[PDB]
Design a protein around this ligand. Sequence first.
Ligand SMILES: CCCCCCCCO[C@@H]1O[C@H](CO)[C@@H](O)[C@H](O)[C@H]1O
Ligand code: NA
Ligand code: NA
Lengths: 409, 407
Amino acid sequence: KIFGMPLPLYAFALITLLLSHFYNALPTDIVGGFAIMFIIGAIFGEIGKRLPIFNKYIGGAPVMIFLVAAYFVYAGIFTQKEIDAISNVMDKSNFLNLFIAVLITGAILSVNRRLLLKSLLGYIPTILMGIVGASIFGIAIGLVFGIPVDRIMMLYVLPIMGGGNGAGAVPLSEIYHSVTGRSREEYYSTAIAILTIANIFAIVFAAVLDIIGKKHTWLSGEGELVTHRETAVGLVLSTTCFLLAYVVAKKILPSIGGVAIHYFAWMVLIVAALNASGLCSPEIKAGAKRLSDFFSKQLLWVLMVGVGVCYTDLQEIINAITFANVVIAAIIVIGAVLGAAIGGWLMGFFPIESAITAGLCMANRGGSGDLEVLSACNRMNLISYAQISSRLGGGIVLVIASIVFGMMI
Amino acid sequence: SDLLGFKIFGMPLPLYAFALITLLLSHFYNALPTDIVGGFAIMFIIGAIFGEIGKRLPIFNKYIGGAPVMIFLVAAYFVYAGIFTQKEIDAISNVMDKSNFLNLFIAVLITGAILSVNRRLLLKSLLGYIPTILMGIVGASIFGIAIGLVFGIPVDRIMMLYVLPIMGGGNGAGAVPLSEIYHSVTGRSREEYYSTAIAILTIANIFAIVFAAVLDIIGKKHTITHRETAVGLVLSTTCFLLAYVVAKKILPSIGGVAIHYFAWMVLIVAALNASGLCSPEIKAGAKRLSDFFSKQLLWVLMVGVGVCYTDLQEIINAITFANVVIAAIIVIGAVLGAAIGGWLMGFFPIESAITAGLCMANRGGSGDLEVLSACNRMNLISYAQISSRLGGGIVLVIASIVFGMMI
Ligand SMILES: CCCCCCCCO[C@@H]1O[C@H](CO)[C@@H](O)[C@H](O)[C@H]1O
Ligand code: NA
Ligand code: NA
């Protein structure tokens, strides 16, 4: 079978997809989108699942979809309608945030209340440790390339450790303009480019540390750091918790201190608070979880088709794949992994998991990247932690940036 | 604490309040993402409270349609009264139209309803039961046009605004998608159609439950996993895509008549059923999905329907003591149509008129329960559902034909 469909059945769908493709007729909406994404994701998911060299553990299926889908966009295999349809689902409909919102809610409302605050105290410093590692290693390789320290921090390290595109590139160019006075484009173009390259390496290393994790069990924790109506309620909660966090980060409490708190960061606090309040009955708490499983196990391959389209512009990467950037960026990511591994080990967490959540999930392209990374190491259950790095840890990088930027001038 | 437990859409009062307060915060501060998440957040919560309210009300629940009706009317009143903000209207509309949740919803419904029907029962049903249903529609048509001409009302209106909606598969299944076909063939507003259609259809549903008890007196007097569900979602979308491709590029029109893509879908999905390409496990998966929509997300959709597809003025204008007559006689035409057709096919006239007649003019599934309870024949639920579901899919095909040639 292909995604739970007998070969004959899948062919029916596959033929349908080709008919829509060749006649160039496809609704640019949810239905048209999911139809393509389901089918396309299905075949390449299975392929990735069975390619011997290509698939290793969890990373064999999602990574395949992701990379192949981006190659379809770059190669111009997708039609403008098809790209629009997938994009309409990812961004206009904003399936990405929904997906993450459901994950966060499902992951948090599953755990004990007492265990909650035990982590968050030790996590943030581990993230700082990863940044130090990312810095130290970056400057080390940078001097090896004859590149001044300032550039390494401004154009390499800070953007990579940034909260991704919307959260880091978009605001880090703002801070750059505010401190330097120079054009935002000059910065963002270089930043967005390099950050995407590191995001690629982050997804690669996530699978590497997964193999290493199952090979050296003492480092790994194996995915641990330290009726329909119920499922329907989980979906209400996933959206409603997102709405509240949204309202807080926009109009009530956009920033606690010098740090600006992203709405996803707030959501994590909100959902965790809702858990500790015990407002949700155990049945409903499970409903959230079962819904989160439906997304993480059924719709994950669909999301990846979208991730490969919207959030991986292969053109811009190639415009900056000078050997130099490729090496520097990659080693910065390694510095993050070793930074978070050391820091987490000292804090109490498993080195493998630490390096993934506080390391790779920091160097990745924020939320889209979190999904891409966590899916490569099958530790999708850490979405809540990955988001803390991308959102709260991302907010930290801006504060650091404003400091770093001023000193360099 | 006894009352703290009372549930609103499966949520204890205290929990719902959390959400209800969140909705008001988004409303007061005027901060809401105009996307899927923002939309569903509002629609879920709003639909929840008014769904229950409509559900609890005695006379309104059983004879008007209850919660789905309460939702789509109240929601339209929010738009008219200006209670919604321009953001909130945009968010809901973005879900309904730009994201096009409507079509997905319907696509899932059609697929789940058709593929749930056993392969044998479907093709068996077609030879005898299905033609009887067609005969009931003919009867419903002929009688409707007869009364319509007696009311000085053109034949177009009688078929489009009276007969077809009544014989339709109810509200979410017939009224909602018939408005789409109407817009796709005429070009006029959906809300003009739906507001009148939904109104008359509910009235006929009332007469259908009445006549069910009449024919009863007359009768006695004159003697297994999420993956399967996921596959259902693939199929629901893919079957829609194929029907889309057909109606746009391949086979836009059989003749002078234009076949709407939803019409084609029904044929496609029914063909897919008869091919038996889908294993029974997957066929159920499609059903279990259609359930999730029909029982969880139906109330959400109605919040949308009230916003875009509801003109509360036209609904008020349609409760004229003229339409009460027209609708009622259309139902009688269905009863006599199904009685004749069934008698020729081999079935009992009383039972035929109930299953292939009244169960067609009633409000889909909710109606079947209401009708088959009035006459003690609840054991015909399996037949009643064939009319409401397969017969309801037939009505869309006929509609797509009737609409085009009439325009
Ligand atoms: C304020 C909340 C911060 C902590 C959020 C993490 C809780 C949700 O995340 C959970 O963490 C657990 C403990 O590692 C893991 O067992 C689960 O895999 C994960 O779902
Ligand atoms: Na980053
Ligand atoms: Na009906």
